[PDB]
């Protein structure tokens, strides 16, 4: 059909060994869980495609111009997204000690 | 240029009387099957009591 | 043969043309185009008079050129 | 409820129908393409009679078109409203009969009955409660009248209880248009009396008679003559589709216009019909309609009604009108002309009213009356037939296709008997 | 993965074989030099050149033929003409001394010095292809070289390769018109060898085509160059299904399965239509129904044998062009109705119908004009008993006094060989009659 | 499943042709193609090498 129970959604994440935060767990549900006051019927059709977009760009056909992503050590690099970048305000002192 | 264009690769590999049936008969919703029209309609604790009997001869079908 | 014309002059009316005619009041048979048609037709007839006479003499003069040359 | 099917054959039969379905069509508001756009709710209450339903809601007349030559039915389609007829119903051959009755009744017409009759038996069976059949055909063409009559005989043997209507056009002797007419009319007319329940006679000479002198149209054409017949033919079944003061279907008219089984020949007409140049002097009131419906020149049959005596008459008025002025005016015409009316059947006129007048008109009437004047038509046809037969002229055509000369004598006698017997009453007294 | 090896033996085969290649060469966009132009390519589908050609890796192609003849004049012409670049240099194997119409000469004495080389060349071409369907062998019976070489090569092939199918498109002597004076002698001997070693062999007598040329093309001055071309079209017809698309095709192996009721009776005669010149080819519709009428007209038969004197065993009659299957149904039915074509009692239906789309090509400079629909027929009929009938009678007259015999006995062949051929031909005469008797 | 057919004036280099929902990118022109287009009189587009 295109929808699975919300709780069963939690089942895959725990089994898949990929760890997620509770507030993040809320984030996925708010974006994917079927728009209903009660629970149940969380649709993975939208989630599965986007997450898998990094492997091979499914459905490449029908658009010859487009070229899939190559991905590289720079793909996990965005995993570095963090608030530690503040040092970018002034890295000169970091430069001085380093040299 | 009426019937001289005939070619063997065109006559044989072009279906004649078995293409899609003309419109006005395709008006059907493949997703709607019986047991879905009424049982799955929704149901309601209170029904809309309103009834009406239009003052025109009901169409015979 | 087939009959695709009601008469020699008017094509069958456009389907929107017959609004009435349910009762015998509109007929398209009362003409009222008869006078106009005759006037235009008679003038056209004269045109073929002049056109054909010109060809005939042109043939004759060339024919008479045959005799004069023979002289 | 009590609908009627249509079976029009032969060219002259084909053209007449070519406009008839256009006439009634504009009455109920059926568009040329088959979608409904009518205004009044009543314009759809009783549409079942002439029209049938199909998926997608488009409406198809339940008519049968038949002929032996391609020209008739390959042309009617190209005109307005030419697509309403269903493609299957068309039945046409490949040869043609050439006005030879023999070609139309034994060799080509008979061989082609199997297909044509099949469609009729399928179409009629689909009715809820059928009323009958109406046949339009011309008696001047061999191919038309040839298989035209044979169809009537076959139908009667399997539908004994449904009425049978036929509007035949027979050639008047003043304007001659076919040379082999006498053979076709005399033999064909023999079959109609024995089988047909009712037939209203129509003559071209009158159509011109009506056109020049009352509609004052300068140049008549074949289209105009068709128009008047169609309007008149719509009147006979006028009230069958609409409510009225006194509803009167076809069976009702029969019960008041056929004194005896073998006198079933009528003559009809329409009124009013005012000239484009006269509609501002005439006054539309009930008295005007009654007088014109009896005037001799209006009748579609060349035989003047005043040469004999009336036996039965019916008038189906249209629109709203005081039933007083129908009865009183109708009674008016039966006391000041006692010489023209048979005596042993008192008040020999029928009355009816329909509540929906023809579009664009307020009062109108159609007549159906069996008059002894029709005796004139049979005599003129009979006189010519005997003249041409004493020398066996043109007889080699029919004798060479399995038909023997005895049948012609039998046709003459029964037709000969009709003329004499038909007048055993106009001299009869109580 | 389908192929066929072409063998031309004798001048009659060579000259007709020469003709069959211009038609084949054009039909796939290959110029005389063998190189496919880098521009103006007309090729439908791929591998089409594979049925008769083999790739050289880049550029041109090669024909799959081996020409054999002991007379250098005929062979030497090709190597100096405009098709020199086409053939492989060392496959035009030829000798020095002519056969001289002595059938023994090409089969016992002179032939043995070339047959060994010919087979070896056949070995090389056998390995190159993958699943060879069969061979096509062309030869003129009326000559010792064609008759002598043909028998020797066929017998070796029947033992070297085995069950593979082989076809022989011979040219038998005419009833009254014949160029040679010893043709009857080598005709009887040839059929003796070719009856026991070939699958399908057709009749192509010269005299009939002369009538074929005159009636339609309206040309009173024909020569062998025009004659051979007509055989080219029939050559194309029989193989239309092996290198093209279609709706209902036929394989070459589906010929020893529909046209030979018994092993012995396997002689069949053809017929072609339409053949209408460019001056008149465009004033008629050329319907499928009417064209097949010309196919069975008695005069247009490929050979001078009137079919009306016998039975019709089976006609695997082929199609090429714009033919819809429904029309073919109406054409087969109409033929059976006619009373002038009468079949055998034990063959209710005798038609194997085939269809191909690629229309016939037009060879420039020839006589044929372009058409839409063409039907070539390979029909087996009891009328063929006549052709063997007259040939046997002619043999009787000349051997009563055994004139011309002593030019053979000096070639090493035993005397009894001549009489033996009569047993094969004569016994064949009694077999046809037995096939046709109603039971 | 339609009733409209191509006319040679539709094909061209650099444009997308529709063929069984698969998208084709016709890229290069053979030597003989150019002349016919110039002869008939419909413009021709500049080529580019195939990635
Ligand atoms: N007073 C009055 N009489 C009527 C009316 N309608 C019909 N009639 C009478 O009916 C006679 C005509 O025939 P009907 O009796 O009406 O026949 P019907 O009513 O159709 O009966 P069926 O034909 O059997 O259905 C007239 O003579 C009238 O006397 C009406 O509206 N008022
Ligand atoms: N169809 C056709 N037959 C030919 C042609 N040329 C010769 N023939 C036939 O060949 C027969 C005689 O044999 P040749 O063609 O001269 O050659 P051969 O049979 O191989 O014998 P050799 O000439 O000694 O090699 C004649 O009876 C002809 O029927 C030709 O160009 N076309
Ligand atoms: N009402 C009417 N009758 C016509 C018209 N045209 C011809 N006729 C009549 O048709 C008759 C000829 O019928 P014909 O065509 O031979 O019938 P067929 O034998 O079935 O082909 C003539 O006698 C005319 O009176 C027309 O436009 N209207
Ligand atoms: Mg009543
Ligand atoms: Mg030689």
Q: Could you tell me the residue ranges of all domains in chain D?
A: 3-256, 265-374
Q: D406 CA to middle of ligand 3, Å?
A: 29
CB of D9 sitting under 6 A from ligand 3: no
Provide the token pair at F13.
């280099």
- Kindly report the protein residue whose alpha carbon is nearest to atom 20 of ligand 3: D144
Give the residue from chain B lying closest to E326, CA to CA.
Answer: B12
User: Angle of helix D142-156 relative to helix D181-195, nearest 10 degrees?
Assistant: 10
Residue whose CB lies within 8 A of the most ligand 3 atoms, among D12, D144, D151, for a mutation test = D12
Number of Cβ within 10 Å of residue D227's Cβ equals 22
- For chain D, list the contacting chains (3+ Cβ pairs, <8 Å): B, C
Rg (CA), chain D: 21
Query: Parallel, antiparallel, or unpaired for β F22-25 and E375-381?
Result: unpaired
Burial of E105 (0-12, 13-18, 19+ CB in 10 A): buried
The DSSP secondary structure of E210-233, one letter per residue, reads: HHHHHHHH--S---HHHHHHHHHH
CB of D149 sitting under 6 A from ligand 3: no
Q: What is the rounded CA–CA span in Å between residue D409 and residue D111?
A: 26
Q: What is the rounded CA–CA span in Å between residue B61 and residue B59?
A: 6
Residue whose C-alpha is closest to residue A12's, from A76, A81, A32: A32
Q: What is the rounded CA–CA span in Å between residue D358 and residue D365?
A: 10
Q: What is the rounded CA–CA span in Å between residue A57 and residue A52?
A: 8
For residue D216, what is the DSSP state? Answer: -
Burial of E194 (0-12, 13-18, 19+ CB in 10 A): buried
Quick check: D64 and D119 in contact, CB under 8 A? yes
Query: What is the C-alpha end-to-end distance of chain F, expressed in Å?
Result: 33
H or E element, residue D310: strand D310-318
Return the ∠ at Cα F11 (arms to F5 and F13), rounded to 5°: 160
Q: Alpha helices, DSSP H only, in E61-149?
A: 72-80, 112-128, 144
Residue whose C-alpha is closest to residue E34's, from E87, E88, E86, E78: E86
Q: Provide the sign of the torsion angle of the four alpha carbons D173, D179, D183, D188, taken in this order.
A: negative
Burial of D199 (0-12, 13-18, 19+ CB in 10 A): buried
Beta carbons of F31 and E38 less than 8 Å apart? yes
Q: D246 CA to middle of ligand 1, Å?
A: 7
Sort out which chain D residues have CB atoms less than 8 A from B56's CB and list them. 41
CA atoms within a 13 Å half-sphere pointing along the CA-CB vector of E32: 9
Rg (CA), chain E: 22
Tell me whether the CATH fold assigned to D3-256 matches the one assigned to D265-374: no
Determined by which method? cryo-EM
Quick check: D137 and D65 in contact, CB under 8 A? no
Query: What is the C-alpha end-to-end distance of chain E, expressed in Å?
Result: 45
Q: What is the rounded CA–CA span in Å between residue E277 and residue E368?
A: 5
Side-by-side strand order, sheet with E267-273: E65-68, E4-9, E134-140, E165-171, E200-203, E267-273, E375-381, E312-317
Q: What is the rounded CA–CA span in Å between residue D214 and residue D275?
A: 6
Residue whose C-alpha is closest to residue E275's, from E203, E209, E210, E368: E368
Provide the token pair at D108.
């080509």
For residue E169, what is the DSSP state? Answer: E
Q: What is the rounded CA–CA span in Å between residue D272 and residue D364?
A: 6
CB-based burial, E398-418: b 16+ in 10 Å, e otherwise = ebeeeeeeebbeebebeeeeb
Provide the token pair at E70.
């002991």
CB of D144 sitting under 6 A from ligand 3: yes
Query: What is the C-alpha end-to-end distance of chain D, expressed in Å?
Result: 42
Residue whose C-alpha is closest to residue D137's, from D5, D8, D15, D229: D8
Distances (CA, A) of C10 to C13, C14, D208: 8, 11, 20
Number of Cβ within 10 Å of residue A45's Cβ equals 11
CA atoms within a 13 Å half-sphere pointing along the CA-CB vector of D213: 10
Which of B4, B12, B16 to mutate: most E Cβ within 10 Å? B12
Q: Provide the sign of the torsion angle of the four alpha carbons C44, C49, C52, C57, taken in this order.
A: negative
Question: Which residues fall within 8 angstroms of residue E29, CB to CB, at 6 or more apart?
Answer: E36, E37, E41, E42, E43
Q: What is the rounded CA–CA span in Å between residue E67 and residue E81?
A: 16
Residues in a beta bridge with E379: E269, E315
CB of D100 sitting under 6 A from ligand 3: no
- For residue E359, cis peptide bond before it (omega within 30 degrees of 0): no
H or E element, residue E154: helix E150-160
Residue whose C-alpha is closest to residue B14's, from F24, E322, E370, E356: E322
Quick check: D307 and D376 in contact, CB under 8 A? yes
Three-state secondary structure call for residue E58: coil
Q: D247 CA to middle of ligand 4, Å?
A: 7
CB-based burial, E239-250: b 16+ in 10 Å, e otherwise = bbbbbbbbeeeb
Give the residue from chain D lying closest to C26, CA to CA.
Answer: D276
Residue whose C-alpha is closest to residue E106's, from E189, E40, E3: E189
Q: What is the rounded CA–CA span in Å between residue D203 and residue D209?
A: 10
**Topology of domain D265-374, per CATH?**
60s Ribosomal Protein L30; Chain: A; (3.30.1330)
Burial of D187 (0-12, 13-18, 19+ CB in 10 A): buried
Provide the token pair at D304.
């003047």
Quick check: E422 and E343 in contact, CB under 8 A? no
Three-state secondary structure call for residue D365: strand
Provide the token pair at D320.
């709203």
- For residue D272, cis peptide bond before it (omega within 30 degrees of 0): yes
Question: Tokens 């977009």 map to which residue?
Answer: A53
Q: What is the rounded CA–CA span in Å between residue E397 and residue E403?
A: 9
Q: For chain C, percent helix, then strand, then coil, each to nearest 5?
A: 50, 0, 50
Return the ∠ at Cα A72 (arms to A69 and A75), rounded to 5°: 80
- B57 to chain D, minimum CA–CA distance in Å? 6
Quick check: D181 and D24 in contact, CB under 8 A? no
* Residue F21 contacts A, CB cutoff 8 Å: yes
Quick check: D94 and D69 in contact, CB under 8 A? no
Quick check: E22 and E48 in contact, CB under 8 A? no
Distances (CA, A) of D53 to B23, B58, D50: 17, 15, 10
Sort out which chain F residues have CB atoms less than 8 A from B9's CB and list them. none
* Residue B19 contacts F, CB cutoff 8 Å: yes
Question: Tokens 């599965």 map to which residue?
Answer: A48
Rg (CA), chain C: 24
Rg (CA), chain B: 25
Provide the token pair at E375.
């039907």
Q: Of E155, E207, E254, E386, which is the active-site residue? A: E254
Residue whose C-alpha is closest to residue D314's, from D262, D237, D244, D253: D253
Q: Provide the sign of the torsion angle of the four alpha carbons E78, E79, E85, E91, taken in this order.
A: positive
Three-state secondary structure call for residue E77: helix
Question: Which residues fall within 8 angstroms of residue E67, CB to CB, at 6 or more apart?
Answer: E8, E9, E14, E17, E75, E78, E87, E91, E92, E93, E94
Quick check: D8 and D14 in contact, CB under 8 A? yes
Three-state secondary structure call for residue B22: coil
Return the ∠ at Cα E181 (arms to E175 and E183), rounded to 5°: 60
Quick check: D239 and D364 in contact, CB under 8 A? no
Q: Provide the sign of the torsion angle of the four alpha carbons D149, D152, D157, D160, taken in this order.
A: negative
Sort out which chain F residues have CB atoms less than 8 A from E38's CB and list them. 31
- CATH class of the D3-256 domain in this structure: alpha beta
Q: What is the rounded CA–CA span in Å between residue D310 and residue A33?
A: 91
Residue whose C-alpha is closest to residue E208's, from E186, E234, E239: E234
Give the residue from chain A lying closest to F51, CA to CA.
Answer: A65
Return the ∠ at Cα E264 (arms to E262 and E265), rounded to 5°: 70
Phi and psi angles of residue D402, each rounded to the nearest 5 degrees, phi first: 85, 0
Resolution in A: 4.1
Number of Cβ within 10 Å of residue D31's Cβ equals 16
Q: What is the rounded CA–CA span in Å between residue E259 and residue E347?
A: 12
Residue whose C-alpha is closest to residue E300's, from E344, E270, E265, E335: E270
Q: D148 CA to middle of ligand 3, Å?
A: 13
Q: What is the rounded CA–CA span in Å between residue E437 and residue C19?
A: 81
* Residue B18 contacts E, CB cutoff 8 Å: no
* Residue F46 contacts B, CB cutoff 8 Å: no
Number of Cβ within 10 Å of residue C62's Cβ equals 9
For residue E142, what is the DSSP state? Answer: T
Return the ∠ at Cα E172 (arms to E166 and E176), rounded to 5°: 170
Residue whose CB lies within 8 A of the most ligand 2 atoms, among E7, E10, E11, for a mutation test = E11
Residue whose C-alpha is closest to residue D385's, from D418, D354, D408, D363: D408
Beta carbons of D55 and B24 less than 8 Å apart? yes
* Residue D41 contacts B, CB cutoff 8 Å: yes
Distances (CA, A) of C28 to D219, E140, E182, E253: 10, 85, 94, 76
Return the ∠ at Cα E313 (arms to E308 and E318), rounded to 5°: 95
Q: What is the rounded CA–CA span in Å between residue D273 and residue D235?
A: 14
Query: Parallel, antiparallel, or unpaired for β D163-169 and D132-138?
Result: parallel
Q: Alpha helices, DSSP H only, in D175-280?
A: 181-195, 204-210, 222-236, 250-254
The DSSP secondary structure of D123-147, one letter per residue, reads: HHHT-SS--EEEEEEESS-HHHHHH
Number of Cβ within 10 Å of residue E134's Cβ equals 20
Q: Is E254 a catalytic residue?
A: yes
Beta strands in D319-415 (DSSP E): 350-354, 364-371
Quick check: D22 and D80 in contact, CB under 8 A? yes
CB of E334 sitting under 6 A from ligand 2: no
CB of E71 sitting under 6 A from ligand 2: yes
Residue whose C-alpha is closest to residue E132's, from E6, E40, E22, E299: E6
Phi and psi angles of residue A68, each rounded to the nearest 5 degrees, phi first: -65, 165
User: Angle of helix D405-422 relative to helix D375-389, nearest 10 degrees?
Assistant: 150
| Chains A and C contact (Cβ–Cβ under 8 Å for 3 or more pairs) | no
Quick check: D278 and D269 in contact, CB under 8 A? no
Q: D244 CA to middle of ligand 1, Å?
A: 12
Residues in a beta bridge with E376: E272
The DSSP secondary structure of D374-393, one letter per residue, reads: GHHHHHHHHHHHHHHHTTTT
Neighbours of ion ligand 5 (CB under 5 A): E 71, 98
CB of E205 sitting under 6 A from ligand 2: no
Complete domains list, chain E, with CATH: 3-267 (3.40.50.1440), 268-386 (3.30.1330.20)
- For chain F, list the contacting chains (3+ Cβ pairs, <8 Å): A, B, E
Sort out which chain A residues have CB atoms less than 8 A from F24's CB and list them. 64
Quick check: D92 and B61 in contact, CB under 8 A? no
Beta carbons of B8 and E357 less than 8 Å apart? yes
Q: Nearest 10 degrees: CA dihedral of E34, E40, E44, E45?
A: 70
Quick check: E284 and E186 in contact, CB under 8 A? no
Three-state secondary structure call for residue D190: helix
Question: Which residues fall within 8 angstroms of residue A32, CB to CB, at 6 or more apart?
Answer: A9, A42, A43, A44, A46, A47
Question: Which residues fall within 8 angstroms of residue D404, CB to CB, at 6 or more apart?
Answer: none
Beta carbons of D48 and B24 less than 8 Å apart? no
- B59 to chain F, minimum CA–CA distance in Å? 36
Phi and psi angles of residue D91, each rounded to the nearest 5 degrees, phi first: -135, 115
- For chain E, list the contacting chains (3+ Cβ pairs, <8 Å): B, F
């Amino acid at each position: 059909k295109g929808v699975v129970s919300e709780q069963q959604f939690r089942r895959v994440l725990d089994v898949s060994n990929i760890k997620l935060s509770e507030q993040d767990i809320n984030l996925l549900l708010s974006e994917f869980k079927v728009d209903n006051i009660p629970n149940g019927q969380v649709r993975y059709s939208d989630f599965c495609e986007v997450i898998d977009e990094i492997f091979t760009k499914k459905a490449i056909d029908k658009d010859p111009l487009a070229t899939v992503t190559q991905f590289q050590p720079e793909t996990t690099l965005p995993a570095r997204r963090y608030y530690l970048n503040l040092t970018e305000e002034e890295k000169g002192q970091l430069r001085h000690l380093l040299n | 240029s009426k019937k001289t264009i005939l070619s063997g690769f065109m006559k044989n590999n072009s279906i004649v009387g078995f293409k899609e049936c003309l419109d006005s008969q395709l008006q059907l919703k493949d997703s709607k099957s019986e047991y879905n029209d009424k049982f799955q309609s929704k149901n309601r604790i209170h029904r809309d009591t309103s009834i009406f009997h239009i003052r025109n001869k009901s169409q015979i079908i | 043969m087939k009959r695709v014309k009601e008469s020699y002059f008017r094509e069958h009316p456009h389907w929107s043309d017959i609004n009435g005619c349910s009762g015998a009041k509109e007929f398209e048979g009362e003409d009222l185009a008869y006078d106009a048609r005759i006037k235009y037709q008679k003038e056209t007839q004269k045109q073929w008079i002049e056109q054909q006479i010109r060809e005939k003499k042109m043939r004759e003069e060339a024919e008479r050129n045959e005799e004069r040359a023979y002289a | 409820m009590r609908e009627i099917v249509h079976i029009q054959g032969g060219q002259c039969g084909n053209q007449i129908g070519a406009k008839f379905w256009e006439v009634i069509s504009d009455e109920h508001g059926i568009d040329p393409t088959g979608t409904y756009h009518g205004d009044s709710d009543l314009q759809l209450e009783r549409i079942n009679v002439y029209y049938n339903e199909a998926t997608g809601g488009r409406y198809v007349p339940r008519a049968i078109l038949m002929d032996l030559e391609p020209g008739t039915m390959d042309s009617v389609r190209a005109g307005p409203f030419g697509q309403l007829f269903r493609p299957d119903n068309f039945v046409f051959g490949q040869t043609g009969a050439g006005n030879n009755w023999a070609k139309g009744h034994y060799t080509e017409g008979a061989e082609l009955i199997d297909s044509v009759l099949d469609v009729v038996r399928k179409e009629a069976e689909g009715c809820d409660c059928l009323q009958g059949f109406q046949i339009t055909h011309s008696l001047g063409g061999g191919t038309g009248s040839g298989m035209g009559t044979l169809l009537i005989s076959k139908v009667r043997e399997e539908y004994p209880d449904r009425i049978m209507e036929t509007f035949s056009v027979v050639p008047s002797p003043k304007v001659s248009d076919t040379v082999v007419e006498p053979y076709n009319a005399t033999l064909s007319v023999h079959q109609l009396v024995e089988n047909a329940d009712e037939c209203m006679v129509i003559d071209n000479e009158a159509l011109y008679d009506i056109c020049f002198r009352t509609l004052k149209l300068t140049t008549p054409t074949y289209g105009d003559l068709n128009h008047l017949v169609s309007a008149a033919m719509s009147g006979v079944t006028c009230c069958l589709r609409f409510p009225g003061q006194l509803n009167s279907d076809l069976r009702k008219l029969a019960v008041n216009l056929i004194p005896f089984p073998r006198l079933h020949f009528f003559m009809i007409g329409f009124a009013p019909l005012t000239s484009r140049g006269s509609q501002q002097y005439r006054a539309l009131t009930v008295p005007e309609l009654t007088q014109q419906m009896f005037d001799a020149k209006n009748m579609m049959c060349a035989a003047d009604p005043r040469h004999g005596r009336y036996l039965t008459a019916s008038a189906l008025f249209r629109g709203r009108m005081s039933t007083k002025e129908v009865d009183e005016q109708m009674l008016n015409v039966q006391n000041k002309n006692s010489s023209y009316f048979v005596e042993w059947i008192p008040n020999n006129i029928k009355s009816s009213i329909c509540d929906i007048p023809p579009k664009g008109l307020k009062m109108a009437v159609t007549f159906v009356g069996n008059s002894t004047a029709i005796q004139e038509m049979f005599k003129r046809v009979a006189e010519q037939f005997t003249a041409m037969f004493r020398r066996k002229a043109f007889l080699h055509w029919y004798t060479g296709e399995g038909m023997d000369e005895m049948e012609f004598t039998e046709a003459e006698s029964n037709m000969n008997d009709l003329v004499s017997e038909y007048q055993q009453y106009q001299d009869a007294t109580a | 993965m389908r192929e066929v090896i072409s063998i031309h033996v004798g001048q009659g085969g060579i000259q007709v074989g020469n003709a069959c290649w211009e038609l084949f060469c054009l039909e796939h966009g290959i110029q005389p030099d063998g190189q496919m132009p880098s521009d103006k390519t007309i090729g439908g589908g791929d591998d089409a050149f594979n049925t008769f050609f083999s790739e050289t890796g880049a550029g041109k192609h090669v024909p799959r033929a081996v020409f054999l003849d002991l007379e250098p004049t005929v062979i030497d012409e090709v190597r100096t003409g405009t098709y020199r670049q086409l053939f492989h240099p060392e496959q035009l194997i030829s000798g020095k001394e002519d056969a001289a119409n002595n059938f023994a000469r090409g089969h016992y004495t002179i032939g043995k010095e070339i047959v060994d080389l010919c087979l070896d060349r056949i070995r090389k071409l056998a390995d190159n292809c993958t699943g060879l369907q069969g061979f096509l062998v062309f030869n003129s019976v009326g000559g010792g070289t064609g008759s002598g070489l043909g028998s020797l090569l066929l017998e070796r092939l029947s033992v070297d390769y085995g069950k593979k199918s082989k076809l022989g498109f011979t040219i038998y002597p005419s009833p009254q018109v014949s160029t040679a004076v010893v043709e009857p002698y080598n005709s009887i001997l040839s059929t003796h060898s070719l009856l026991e070693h070939t699958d399908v062999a057709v009749m192509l007598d010269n005299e009939a085509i002369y009538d074929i040329c005159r009636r339609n093309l309206d040309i009173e001055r024909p020569t062998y160059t025009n004659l051979n071309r007509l055989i080219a079209q029939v050559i194309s017809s029989l193989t239309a299904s092996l290198r093209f698309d279609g709706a209902l095709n036929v394989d070459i192996t589906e010929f020893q399965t529909n046209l030979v009721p018994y092993p012995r009776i396997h002689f069949m005669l053809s017929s072609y239509a339409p053949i209408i010149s460019a001056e008149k080819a465009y004033h008629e519709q050329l319907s499928v129904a009417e064209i097949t009428n010309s196919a069975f007209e008695p005069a247009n038969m490929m050979a001078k044998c009137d079919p009306r004197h016998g039975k019709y065993m089976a006609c695997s009659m082929m199609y090429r062009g714009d033919v819809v299957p429904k029309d073919v149904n109406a054409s087969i039915a109409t033929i059976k109705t006619k009373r002038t074509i009468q079949f055998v009692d034990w063959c209710p239906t005798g038609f194997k119908v085939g269809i191909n789309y690629q229309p016939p090509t037009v060879v420039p400079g020839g006589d044929l004009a372009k058409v839409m629909r063409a039907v070539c027929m390979i029909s087996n009929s009891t009328a063929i008993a006549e052709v063997f009938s007259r040939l046997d009678h002619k043999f009787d007259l000349m051997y009563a006094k055994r004139a011309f015999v002593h030019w053979y006995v000096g070639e090493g062949m035993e005397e009894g060989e001549f009489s033996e051929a009569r047993e094969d031909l004569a016994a064949l005469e009694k077999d046809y009659e037995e096939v046709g008797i109603e039971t | 499943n339609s009733t409209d057919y191509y006319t040679w004036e539709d094909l061209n280099v650099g444009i997308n042709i529709n063929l069984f929902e698969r998208v084709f990118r016709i890229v290069d022109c053979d030597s003989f193609t150019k002349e016919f287009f110039v002869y008939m009189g419909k413009k021709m587009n500049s080529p580019e090498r195939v990635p």
